Nucleic acid binder design. Structure first.
Ligand SMILES: Nc1ccn([C@@H]2CS[C@H](COP(=O)(O)OP(=O)(O)OP(=O)(O)O)O2)c(=O)n1
Ligand SMILES: [Mg+2]
Ligand SMILES: [Mg+2]
Lengths: 397, 546
DNA sequence: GTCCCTGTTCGGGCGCCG
DNA sequence: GGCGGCGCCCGAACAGGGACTG
């Protein structure tokens, strides 16, 4: 008993080339795919199938066991689709991998061609070995959709007996949220795991961190120029911001290091602006149709800032990701952890991942991001050269 | 013969029909060879006589083979190809000798009549019809889109059991070539080779003895493989006295091929000899710098050179060196002076850049190439100071990173040639710079106003707003003292100069870079334009005469 | 909207391999 | 004179994004 799956109205399947894999990952993928072929979950195909999506492997946490990850982003974009507001308000949320359950449900035959992938070869000893899925694949939009009726059957008694718990499925994982003490919450999660077999997230600390203005008892012309520039940018977000009185303090061709006392007329204006950045942005409504945009700025020394919005200057959420200021800091590793954290937060809040603007050259990211990826999903991303002013506007003290 | 392997189902793109092209006229020298081939092929069941039942046709021809005494039969299947379904190409790259491990016993086999030993989809043979007599293909024809992939896949399926039950044997499968390596003594290796030949025979595939290499040096993939050295086959550079665009392309392509084992190859000038050309039959005069670069390349090529094989128990070391003008050479090796291979990176990215960005790009290219050949990232040896790199990684607002490396003091060292102050400078004169240009008139003005009362405005013609902003900064830098603070309203010029470039394709930016290098302290600050911020407003009023 | 600048992609040559 | 793979280098086409005109 299979479900027919239609693609986009006028689009084809994925034709994404397979990128190079390290020997470690190739060996793991070959082991995993041998085991999967035996069990009938995948089968060998040839070049007559014109489709391809990339595959790699990630080593799980505190484990020697690798995990096969298929980048189904192109496939997910091209399969036309067929969220609890209170989960973000719970005290604890646990993320449970429920992916392999999909391997019980067979995949529609006509659609199988679209799930083709190609295991590569070290030094191209052989041509690539091509496979396709016979069951619901981990990482594809349709797998939790098709499995949803079975999943609701699985979760009906647990929800009935535990009405205070919030269970939300996003593609390969369940998000289980509650307000119980840590230990009792863990025991309930173990109840749910035993239920699944029978067949570390706190959304309170998630602070919308504001834009803060420098506090000084002595202001140079340079300082006031920086402040007027920042406020003129921020008025694109908070229109009530005035600069007139501060801007008047600069009349003349003064030295940058010259000290400027703040007139009471301008100090009141600065205080007004400081208070204005405290109240929220008006006219900001979430739109499920339009997708989420997440910008990231590297601030330096383990500090990163991010904004999640849909239209420019109507930020749904701003935030920072703060890692340790270490000697051997890995910018790519930090950026990867940051995009994972932001994507988790978006899946919890809005129920969809954002398209990322990544402040990095495309090649560095494509070369190293897999070395630090740990989630079962993958967000969409593009690569932008962040302007020197946006970082200055969102940085902290 | 014909392999008993299952056929690979092929369709035409939806709605298309087979080709109906008429046969191009040929000489007798090709008709004779094609008849001699087609009679024996139709006897062997590889092609079958078609009647008036097939309405399709495609032109055929023949060319001399690598050995000029045998003819290869080709078919101009361009129409059918355009009408045939899409394939996923399975050959993902080109195996490299440096990724080979030392082996006690080596064999190279060539499969005989490779394509003509793999059957073709029955519902698809009707579209392959040709005429000299009207035949149709029962096997893979040469010139059809689908034949390389279908052969590569069938060869993989055929080899699969032999690989399964001989894990200690290495088989490099390049499309009909088979490199076979083992650590077995010569006798048992020859036994296994016989097993592999008889196994290919059971699947319809012949290994003729004439193309069965048994003793080193083995010829493989364009290289000569010796027991623990490997070389490239000779590279004959043309000595043409008048140079055409096609000749430059052949020369640069041969130089690119040579750069995999010959160190220090440069092609930037010879390649720039192409900028905005017309066709393959335009004579190009060699510039003096191009003549010198070519002489250097020649002197490199007249030197004995070899590579070695990969040892998985020792480290991968990639050492990079800076050539001039965005060119870089590298050597990958494991034991000093015993190179696995060499390479070059000379791609120019960005209108404005510095050597730290270029080096990062090279490190990325070498990393991905190393993962492809050996499956490891190498350990790097870069001509950049650890302090230089940290300073860059601090001041740079993009995420950048380089894997494990150690400094090597082989000039030219990679350096940042200047730094921008993080704070305004006490005692430094403060220049407010600006510029404007009229879109219709194309005329503009650039200038500066200082806190000490200096004013300068300079007229420019055939300029833009952005060029006029860069010119204002240039004026300030020229006229300032060793320490200066500069206040601009141009996010464009700001972004450029903040990126700390040391080279540019804009002459103005280069002059700006030279001035920035000459200074001792520079502080660049930004104010929004048209906001009445003094004294940006005074410069703005001064440079707006249009 | 326009103009200017800049980065990405892709197709066209050639090189090497079969 | 045909095909597929990879490589290089160039220019044409195009996609943001900042700044501008009345
Ligand atoms: N320029 C080329 C070279 C090869 N090919 C294809 C891909 S591999 C196949 C090799 O040709 P054959 O099977 O007839 O074998 P050979 O030509 O090597 O002779 P023998 O080994 O003596 O039987 O032809 C091509 O399409 N274009
Ligand atoms: Mg052959
Ligand atoms: Mg200006």
């Amino acid at each position: 008993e299979t479900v027919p799956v239609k693609l986009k109205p006028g689009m084809d399947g994925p034709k994404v080339k397979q990128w190079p894999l390290t020997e470690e990952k190739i060996k793991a993928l070959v082991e995993i795919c041998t085991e999967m072929e035996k069990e009938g979950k995948i089968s060998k195909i040839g070049p007559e199938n014109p489709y391809n999506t990339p595959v790699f492997a990630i080593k799980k946490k505190d484990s020697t066991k690798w995990r096969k990850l298929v980048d189904f982003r192109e496939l997910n974009k091209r399969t036309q689709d067929f969220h609890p507001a209170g989960l973000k308000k719970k005290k604890s949320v646990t993320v449970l991998d429920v992916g392999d359950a999909y391997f019980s449900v067979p995949l529609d035959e006509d659609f199988r061609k679209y799930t083709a992938f190609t295991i590569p070869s070290i030094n191209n000893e052989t041509p690539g070995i091509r496979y396709q899925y016979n069951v619901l694949p981990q990482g594809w939009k349709g797998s939790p959709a098709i499995f949803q009726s079975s999943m609701t059957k699985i979760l009906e008694p647990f929800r009935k007996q535990n009405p205070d718990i919030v269970i939300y499925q996003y593609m390969d994982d369940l998000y289980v949220g509650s307000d119980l003490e840590i230990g009792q919450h863990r025991t309930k999660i173990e109840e749910l795991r035993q239920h699944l077999l029978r067949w570390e997230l706190h959304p309170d600390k998630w602070t919308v961190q504001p834009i803060v203005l420098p506090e000084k008892d002595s202001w140079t012309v340079n300082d006031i120029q920086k402040l007027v520039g920042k406020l003129n940018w921020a008025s694109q977000i908070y229109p009530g911001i005035k600069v007139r009185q501060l801007s008047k303090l600069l009349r003349g061709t003064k030295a940058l290091t010259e000290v400027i006392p703040l007139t009471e007329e301008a100090e009141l204006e600065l205080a007004e602006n400081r208070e204005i950045l405290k109240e929220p942005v008006h006219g900001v409504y979430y739109d499920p149709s339009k997708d989420l945009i997440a910008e990231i700025q590297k601030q330096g020394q383990g500090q990163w800032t991010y904004q999640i919005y849909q239209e420019p200057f109507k930020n749904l959420k701003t935030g920072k990701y703060a890692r340790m200021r270490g000697a051997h800091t890995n910018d790519v590793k930090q950026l990867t952890e940051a995009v994972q954290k932001i994507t988790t937060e978006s899946i919890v809040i809005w129920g969809k991942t954002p398209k990322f603007k990544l402040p990095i050259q495309k090649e560095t990211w494509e070369t190293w991001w897999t070395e630090y990826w740990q989630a079962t999903w993958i967000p969409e991303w593009e690569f932008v050269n962040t302007p020197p002013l946006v970082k200055l506007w969102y940085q902290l003290e | 013969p014909i392999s008993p392997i299952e056929t690979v189902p092929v369709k035409l793109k939806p709605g298309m029909d087979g080709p109906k092209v008429k046969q191009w006229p040929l000489t007798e020298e090709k008709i004779k060879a094609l008849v001699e081939i087609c009679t024996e092929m139709e006897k062997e069941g590889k092609i079958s006589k078609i009647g008036p039942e097939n309405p399709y046709n495609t032109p055929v021809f023949a060319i001399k083979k690598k050995d000029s005494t045998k003819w290869r039969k080709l078919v101009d299947f361009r129409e059918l190809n355009k009408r045939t379904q899409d394939f996923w190409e399975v050959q993902l790259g080109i195996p490299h000798p440096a990724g080979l491990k030392k082996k006690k016993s080596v064999t190279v086999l060539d499969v005989g009549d490779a394509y003509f030993s793999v059957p073709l989809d029955e519902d698809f043979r009707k579209y392959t019809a040709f005429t000299i007599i009207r035949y149709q293909y029962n096997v893979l024809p040469q010139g059809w889109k689908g034949s390389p992939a279908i052969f590569q896949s069938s060869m993989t399926k055929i080899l699969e059991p032999f690989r399964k039950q001989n894990p200690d044997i290495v088989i490099y499968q390049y499309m009909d070539d088979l490199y076979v390596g083992s650590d077995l003594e010569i006798g048992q290796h020859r036994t296994k080779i016989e097993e592999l030949r008889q196994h290919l025979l059971r699947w319809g595939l012949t290994t003729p003895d004439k193309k069965h290499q048994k003793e080193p040096p083995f010829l493989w993939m364009g290289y000569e493989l010796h027991p623990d050295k490997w070389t490239v086959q000779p590279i004959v550079l043309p000595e043409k006295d008048s140079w055409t665009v096609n000749d430059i392309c052949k020369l640069v392509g041969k130089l690119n091929w040579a750069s995999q084992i010959y160190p220090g190859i440069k092609v930037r000038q010879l390649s720039k000899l192409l900028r905005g050309t017309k066709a393959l039959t335009e004579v190009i005069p060699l510039t003096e710098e191009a003549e010198l670069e070519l002489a250097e390349n020649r002197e490199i090529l007249k030197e004995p050179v070899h590579g070695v094989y990969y040892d998985p128990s020792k480290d991968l070391i990639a050492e990079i060196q800076k050539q001039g003008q965005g060119q870089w050479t590298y050597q990958i090796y494991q034991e000093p002076f015993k190179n696995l291979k060499t390479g070059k990176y000379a791609r120019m990215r960005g209108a404005h850049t510095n050597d730290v960005k270029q080096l990062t790009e090279a490190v990325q290219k070498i990393t991905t190439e190393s993962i492809v050949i050996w499956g490891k990232t190498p350990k790097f040896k870069l001509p950049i100071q650890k302090e230089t790199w940290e300073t860059w990684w601090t001041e740079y607002w993009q995420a950048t990173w380089i894997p494990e490396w150690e400094f090597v003091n082989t000039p030219p060292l990679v350096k940042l040639w200047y730094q921008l102050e993080k704070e305004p400078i006490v005692g430094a004169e403060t220049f407010y710079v600006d510029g404007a240009a009229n879109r219709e008139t194309k005329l503009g003005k650039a200038g500066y106003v200082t806190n000490r009362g200096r004013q300068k405005v300079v007229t420019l013609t055939d300029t833009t707003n952005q060029k006029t902003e860069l010119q204002a900064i240039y004026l300030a830098l020229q006229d300032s003292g060793l320490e200066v603070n500069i206040v601009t309203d141009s996010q464009y010029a700001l972004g450029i100069i903040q990126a700390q470039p040391d080279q540019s394709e804009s002459e103005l930016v280069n002059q700006i870079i030279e001035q920035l290098i000459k200074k001792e302290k520079v502080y660049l600050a930004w104010v929004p334009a048209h906001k009445g911020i003094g004294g940006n407003e005074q410069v703005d009023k001064l440079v707006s005469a249009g």
